[PDB]
Every structure is written in C-alpha cells, then in structure tokens.
C-alpha cells in the first residue's frame, strides 16, 4: 500500500529594528495612540458566548497605574464548570480533525501576528505589561509567532514518526490528544507564553481552559481573539480569567482534568501538583503537569572574559523588562582581578540607563515593574540591601510608586556568596555581585552550582576555551539553558529550547520539538490482514 | 557548518521455534535440567558488593510451589540509603559518558541474551514465573533483546536531534540524565520489563535503584548479572529486592529521588504518586513518575468476523501465561448471530487445552498462576462466577493449589454487560463473554468504551472495513494498543509501542522512540563567537 504524507518547513520570525522612519515604528506609534485613554471591556469567553460576571477586575498600565487599560471579570465555579463541559463536548471532533487542519489555524494566526496585528499586539503588551518596544517585539511578535509556526512544524513531522510494519500486519501510531481538558495558566511577563501554554495543547487535539494573567489581560485577549479569527472553533480554548486559587480548586476538582500547563511561581506549581495528587482517585486518567517556574540565574566571569561583553550582556540580562524574566541574571560572579574594571564600567553604563514611560519615550531601556505586590516585594529587597552587613548597594536602590511601579536598576555587592539575595528570586531589576579570588575560581564554579535551589539559566564569560569546557561540565545541571559568552536571557524558538530542572520546573523545553509530546497520548493500531491460525504452537505438537 | 548524525540500523530479534530437533529446544532442555533441584542464593548488589540481610526470602516455582528456586533477601532502609548514596556518587561520570559507550553495553547484553545466555534466561523465567517455552521466548529473549537494541538506537538517534544554529552563535542540545536517582519497580509477569524499567533510564545516563519482583527474582538477577558482565559499571544499577512499602517509603523520602519507573498495580502507582506529592518540598527536582498499570481488555466481535480467528486469537489472548498480562483479553463481545458457532468452537478448543508443568511437558499451553495471593484472588472470582445470577460458567471453573497454583482456563458468560467481572481486572485465565443483539452493535461499541476504567488493549474482529473504521473511531480512547483482526496481546518492540491511558497508566509507550525522553532532562547550550555590542538598541537612539 501507500499514503501521501506531509512535511512543513518553517523559519523564525525576523526581529524588526523599529528605527526612525521604519514602517513598524510608525505602525506601532499609531497603535499606541489608538490605546491612549481607552479601556477595553474584556469578557470571559465560553464557546462563542461572551460572559460577564459580577466579579469585575481591572488591568492598569505598570508605568502609569492610574490608567485602567482593561476591565475584565473572574469566572466563578459555575462558569468554569460550564466551560469544562462545553470544551469536553467539542473535544472528540477537534481531536479527530487532522493535524494539518489544526496546524493551519496556528499558521494563519502566526501570519496575522506577523503583519496586520503586529503593532496592536506589541502596543497592548507595552501598555499592559510595561514592555519597551523591543521587549514587546521579541515577545508578543517573534516568540509567539515562532511558537505557532514551529509547534505546527513539530506536530506535522510527529505524525510521520510511525512504527515498523511487518506482513501480514500494518502498524500505525495515532497521536490522540489527551482525554479530558487541559488547564492552561499563564504568567504576566510574556504574552508569548500564554499563547503557547493554551495553544500547543490545543494544536495537539486538546481542549483548554485558559486562565490568563490579570496583569497581561489586554494582550492575552488579543491573542485569544486572533486565534479565534484565524479559525479556532468554539470551545477549543475557553478564555476564562479567574481568581488563581479558585481556578486551581475548580480544575483540580474536575474528574475530567487531564493536564495543567503552568508557568509561574514554584509554590503555586507545587500546590497544584499536590491538589492533583490529593484528588488522584477521581480523575479518569492521570493528569499531566507541566511547570516552568523561576530561577536565580548567574553570569559567571572568568579572568579571561571580554569585559565589554560581560558588561553589556549583564546589563541586558539583569535589567531588561526590569529583570522580570525567569531567565534574568541576578548573580554575577567576578574574579578579583577584573572587578575594578567591571565595577567601573557597570557603574558608568548604569548611570546612562533611562527608566520611564516606554510608550512615550522610546529611549527607555526598561519601565516600571508589573504591579504593587511585586513593587512591594522589591522594596523589601532594596531595604534588605541597605540593612544587611554583607551587602552594599553600589548603584540605584531607589523606587517610586507615585506614578508607576518604578524601580531604579540596582546593583548590589555581596561579601557573602550565600547571602539570601544571592539565593532568592526577586523578579526585579536587582543584580547581586560576588567578587571571588582568581586563584579560587574552581571552588567558585562549585559555589555557582551549589548556592541556589534553581537550575534555569546561566552564562560563562571566558576567552579561555579550556575554562569553558570545564565550567560546562561543572555547571551541567545548574542551568538548563547555558550560555557561553552571551547573556542568560533571550531564548529563541528552535534555537534554544527553553527550560531547566532543579526547582525551576519539569523542563519540557517549550521551543523544542519534544515539548508537544506532553500533550499527546499515542494510540498504536495493528491491523492484521490474514486469518490467525491455530491457538496452539508447533513446538507443543 | 557541519552536522554529523549517527543512525543505528536494527532488526527485531527472531523468535525461535523450539520444535523437536532444533538446537534451541536442546539448549533449553539442558538449561532446565541444570536448574532442577537447585536453589540460587541471590544477594542484594550495591556497587560490586554483594550484601545479605537477615530478611531472607524465597522464590518458588508457581507450578510446583514446594520447590524453592531462589533464596534472596530484602534490603533494609539502611541498605537502600547506602545504595542511593553510592549510586549518586557514580552518576556524574556515567551521565558524562557518551551515549554511544553506554548504548554499547546494552548492545552486548542484547547479543549475550540472544545467543549464549538465551537458554538460561528462558529456563529461569519458565521455572521462576511459570512461563511456557514460547512465553519465555517472546519475553525473556525477544522483548528484552529488542528493548536493549531499539532503545540503544533511539538514544543514539536522539543525540542528533539538534537545534538550529545561526551565526554568530552555535546551539547544541545536551541530553542530560535526570539529576538524582531513579527508582525502578518491576512486576512478576515479564522478565523483559524489569530489564527495560531499570535499563532504559540507565541507558539515558541515570543511576537506578532496582526493586525486582519477588516472584521473578531468579530471572531478573540473571538480567542484572548479564548487564554487569556486558560492561555496566558498579552503582549504575543497584540490585535491591525489598519489601514493596518499605522500598517506596525510602525512595519517596529521599531528597534525591528524580524518577520512579513503575509497572504494576494502579493503586500502588497512585500511592507512590501521592507520596511523591506529599514530599514535594524536599526533592531537589520534580520527580518523574512513569506508570504502566493494568487493563480490562476486550475482543469486540462484529457479525462479519472470521470465526476461527476470533477463537484462536481469544484463546491465546485470554489464557496464554494464564491471562497474567495487562494486555490479556478478559471481555469478549459477541453478536447473537455468531454466538452458537463461537461458543461451540470455544468450548471445543477449550477442552483441548493442557495446563501443567511447562518444564516437563512442552505440550502445556499455560501453567500455574504466579503465587498464592493471586491464586486466592482468582478463586474468589471463580466463586463469584458460580454465585452470581447474571453469570454462568461455560467451561472450567476449577483450581488446585496442592502442587502448583493451578487454575483451569475459565469461560464465563454474563447476561449483564456491566457485571463486576466485565469491569474488574482479574489477572487470571478468566474470560467473560457478553452476547449482544446484532441490531444493537453500535450501542455495544459504546458499552465497550464506557464499561471499564481502563484503556490498555483491545481488538476488533470484523471483515467489514466500514465497521472497522467505525470501531476505530469509537474506541479511540478505549485502547492504547488497538488490534484489527488480531489478538490484544503480544506487542512487539518498534512495531507496537506499548501502553494506554485512562487508569492503565501514563502511557509513555515503552517500545517506541519517545519513551526514553522521560529519562533525559535536555540542556541547551548557546555559544556566541563574536563580542556582544552596546546594551542599547538602535531604535532607542
């Protein structure tokens, strides 16, 4: 016999420059102005019904928290259960739909995000989450477009991974979606992640309840709407903002939960994991938990390092988007011999860093952090950085929540490599620096590895190839994304599949080809084409 | 600029015939006699140290439970913790060892099992677990050899799945083993599974605590010894029989647990899962749980079916190895129009079935079931089959534990398609039959799907292609391994990757290429070859 199969070749979305006079700078400016003074009312969406509840909530602009950018509402238990039921009733048909047809929807969404919807999705991310132009670009456009295209490629190619056939039998693998619904819970700090957390499972034949982050609601809903317009049928993804604990209680209580695709804090992930375990007896199948959590990421500097690359790379990793990345560098290990030079260069460039309103002033490096709870926690750390004997603020240290949740980039030196600030994830623009004796760099490599609970990202800066090989070995499990002479942030889909282990999550490497395997439960079909024969065996006669 | 990828070209191990005259029948007979009257003392093995504890245990021959085939002992907490520690101290080197070198060990073990050790491994499985010649062959030889070879192929080819590189940066994926130790817990009913449960993670750079099934100790230790002689370094796999609860308590209490590779009962799997969840805070990473559990598998018969194929296929699936397979057919759905013919044929062939001592009489179809607890459970079901109004024993129904744990093949007709016997996994040679009206075969397809909690295996017998397509759609999630005109047992590696969802497990499909992904935590390395540049962006100037 035979069969016409299919293949799909994709390229990464080019990252636009947005320079003066460039069409994208103009489109973006126009989209930003179209948002000024306007507040979108965003409903919950179950199937095609827009639903409002009485539990109304607002999203404000991080750099100008007086401006409400969106009004939305929390689904209640009753609405969440209706969304599970409606999703389930749509699942069989959607799962049965050919991968090619499903992939097509995400390819069209990708193209929409690429061209016509680009400025919009950028503007909403800038205004809603406080991202500068370029942070919104690499996120709400590039990373999200890539997720859609590359996962589409991965899922189409996956269908061609078929078992061996041996006459008189033909074997085939059917990549079923998981039976049940998936709960997708996305964080504030990347518009791309919400799209991927709900989208990748949907792509794989699942139906999803998507709880988007309150502080990214404006742009996430834009992603939702774009998926729907690209052709996503109703009840495949339910748009259901909600209280976090309520959402988790409801989904972990449904006998129909078959997965949770989560990105956020480890305690919340662990809590969901424990709830699922507590309720194991009620589920029709074992639910799959995928969890990308935070990090306490490092830039390790060897004496041979290009000092300029260390400085720019670290400034970028530590302070871009106000350090609100699970991949952001928060501990810098510098050899004594390089410290004076690196310290001076860092302080010099630090003073050139503009923090302000990213929509009005494109010269802004980064803007306010995301919200009050985060601002509060960051102040507690800045105060710790003044209060602690082992700590000395070298630069910044100020913050001001009168207009936005503004925090100055802060650089702190620790005389204690095990100081809490060297170990605990701040999610703010707060860089800790430990200066180590050149003669003790091997023990220091060991400290990088042993100091925190995390294993997300990390970089080595070294011109000495032998030290690189050596740190690569030593730090094998300190970073799931390991960078050699580059900053620890900015993973690109298909180039650096993203994730790490230890406390940093389950490391399912979104951005790579294996990620989607979490969202399929393969069925293997063997068809035998000849009659069977005696149940007995020759050796028995 | 260059990519070098390696493939490995491997074939399934030929299943030998063992007919009178053949060399394998002779080698086997010799190995069986070399075992008669002998009892191996089997120590725990930690590193290279053989350890005895005071908690001594015996393995007896299922068909002759008076013969002790092995003396072994249970590891205590103290010994299990020393095994964790020693394993951990060996892990970094082993994980660093190139996949090709690790794979080589399992390829040599495979060849050993293929030739010189074949008769031995067969004999120990026949004698220890009660398997007939051919059941031992497809298991302790073919399936185990295939696991080793194919997993080696899959791991070698996996290394060549590398990310895209774009100048000035080169990206590479490093397939790390999981950081910690893996607990492998294997069941009595396949020697191959123990090898795969401990072996596949070891292959992937993990270190393993292997708790083999008490009732398969003789052959499992033979697998262990062969891996060691094939070149497996000490402390990569620790051979540690133990009390089940104690073993689980100890491993789920270690901060170093990073995985559990389990095949067995769902309650035990769920229990382990709940323990890991309870202790989540203490683990250095989130442990990965892989669980293959049981089934309540079906043969669904459409009126168009080849009656002879139905008969021989069902006899084989239901009664081979006394029905002690998670894939064994235990519910047969027959259309009224075909019943008289199928009933007569079944009863006729049933009466031709020899149950006896598989080592002494190769005419034996199947022998005693594994042990007393299982024998006891099976009698409770035979008694249920006499006591229940909806039930009628059509054939067999007797059992005798005076010499071995012997149970006659039993065929029961249920007038109630939802009778507990149609729903609960017996793990005995007990086939239940429901006869349905031809006119109501669609509703009956739905019943097959809706009746039990399981989704492991299932078969449709139908000459009507349109009914096949239809059942395939309806039963999409009733069976992870779906057979068209063939029996529901006997998955072959690389041809039918094995496993199913619902309550039947996590469906990681051992036997396929994706299985090994559970045992690796990939690291992605990006090396940038040019200096970085200003931290600022052009659009900002």
Swiss-Prot record, chains A, B:
Highest expression is found in liver followed by skeletal muscle, kidney, heart, brain, placenta, lung and pancreas. Keywords: Acetylation, Disease variant, Mitochondrion, NAD, Oxidoreductase, Phosphoprotein, Proline metabolism, Transit peptide. NAD(+) binds at residues 186, 211, 264-268, 425. InterPro entries: Ald_DH/histidinol_DH (IPR016161), Ald_DH_C (IPR016163), Ald_DH_CS_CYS (IPR016160), Ald_DH_CS_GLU (IPR029510), Ald_DH_N (IPR016162), Aldehyde_DH_dom (IPR015590), P5CDH/ALDH4A1 (IPR005931). It is found in: Mitochondrion matrix. Pathway: Amino-acid degradation; L-proline degradation into L-glutamate; L-glutamate from L-proline: step 2/2. SUPFAM superfamilies: ALDH-like. The active site is at residues 292, 326. Its EC number is 1.2.1.88. The modification N6-acetyllysine is found at residues 30, 71, 77, 92, 108, 153, 296, 343, 354, 440, 487, 509, 530. Homodimer. Belongs to the aldehyde dehydrogenase family. This is Delta-1-pyrroline-5-carboxylate dehydrogenase, mitochondrial. It comes from Homo sapiens.
């Amino acid at each position: 016999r035979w069969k016409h199969t299919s293949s799909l070749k994709v390229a990464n979305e080019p990252v636009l420059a947005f320079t003066q006079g460039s069409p994208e700078r103009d489109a973006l400016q126009k989209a930003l102005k179209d948002l000024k003074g306007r507040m979108e009312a965003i409903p919950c969406v179950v199937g095609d019904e827009e639903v409002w509840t009485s539990d109304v909530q607002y999203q404000v602009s991080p750099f100008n928290h007086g401006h409400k950018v969106a009004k939305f509402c929390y689904a209640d238990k009753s609405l969440l259960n209706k969304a599970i039921e409606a999703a389930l009733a749509a699942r069989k048909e959607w799962d049965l739909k050919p991968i090619a047809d499903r992939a097509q929807i995400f390819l069209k969404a990708a193209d929409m995000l690429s061209g016509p919807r680009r400025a919009e999705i950028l503007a909403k991310t800038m205004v809603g989450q406080g991202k500068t132009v370029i942070q919104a670009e690499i996120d709400a456009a590039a990373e999200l477009i890539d997720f859609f295209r590359f996962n589409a490629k991965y899922a189409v190619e996956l269908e061609g991974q078929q078992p061996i056939s041996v006459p008189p039998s033909t074997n085939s693998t059917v990549y079923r979606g998981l039976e049940g619904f998936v709960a997708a819970i996305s964080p504030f700090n990347f518009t791309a992640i919400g799209g991927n957390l709900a989208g990748a499972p949907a792509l794989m034949g699942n139906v999803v309840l998507w709880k988007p982050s309150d502080t990214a609601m404006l742009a996430s809903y834009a992603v939702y709407r774009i998926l729907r317009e690209a052709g996503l049928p109703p009840n495949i993804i339910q748009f259901v903002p909600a209280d976090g604990p309520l959402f988790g209680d409801t989904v972990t209580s449904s006998e129909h939960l078959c997965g949770i695709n989560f990105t956020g804090s480890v305690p919340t992930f662990k809590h969901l994991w424990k709830q699922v375990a507590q309720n194991l007896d009620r589920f029709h199948t074992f639910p799959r938990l995928a969890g990308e959590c935070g990090g306490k990421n490092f830039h390790f500097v060897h004496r041979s390092a290009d000092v300029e690359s260390v400085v720019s790379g670290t400034l970028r990793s530590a302070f871009e988007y106000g350090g609100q990345k699970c991949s952001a560098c928060a501990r810098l290990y510098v050899p004594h011999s390089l410290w004076p030079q690196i310290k001076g260069r860092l302080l010099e460039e630090h003073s050139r860093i503009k923090v302000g309103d990213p929509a009005e002033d494109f010269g802004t490096f980064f803007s306010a952090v995301i919200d009050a709870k985060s601002f509060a926690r960051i102040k507690k750390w800045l105060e710790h950085a003044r209060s602690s004997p082992s700590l000395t603020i070298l630069a910044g240290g100020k913050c001001d929540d009168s207009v936005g949740y503004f925090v100055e980039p802060c650089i702190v030196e620790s005389k204690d490599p095990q100081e809490p600030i060297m170990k605990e994830e701040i999610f703010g623009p707060v860089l800790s620096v430990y200066v180590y004796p050149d003669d003790k760099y091997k023990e220091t490599l060991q400290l990088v590895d042993s100091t925190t609970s995390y294993g997300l990202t990390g970089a080595v800066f070294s011109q000495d190839k032998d030290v690189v090989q050596e740190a690569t070995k030593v730090l094998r499990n300190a970073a799931g994304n390991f960078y050699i002479n580059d900053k620890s942030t900015g993973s690109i889909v298909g180039q650096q599949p993203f994730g790490g282990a230890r406390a940093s999550g389950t490391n399912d490497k979104p951005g790579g080809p294996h990620y989607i395997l979490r969202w399929t439960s393969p069925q293997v079909i063997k068809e035998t084409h000849k009659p069977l024969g005696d149940w007995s065996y020759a050796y028995m006669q």
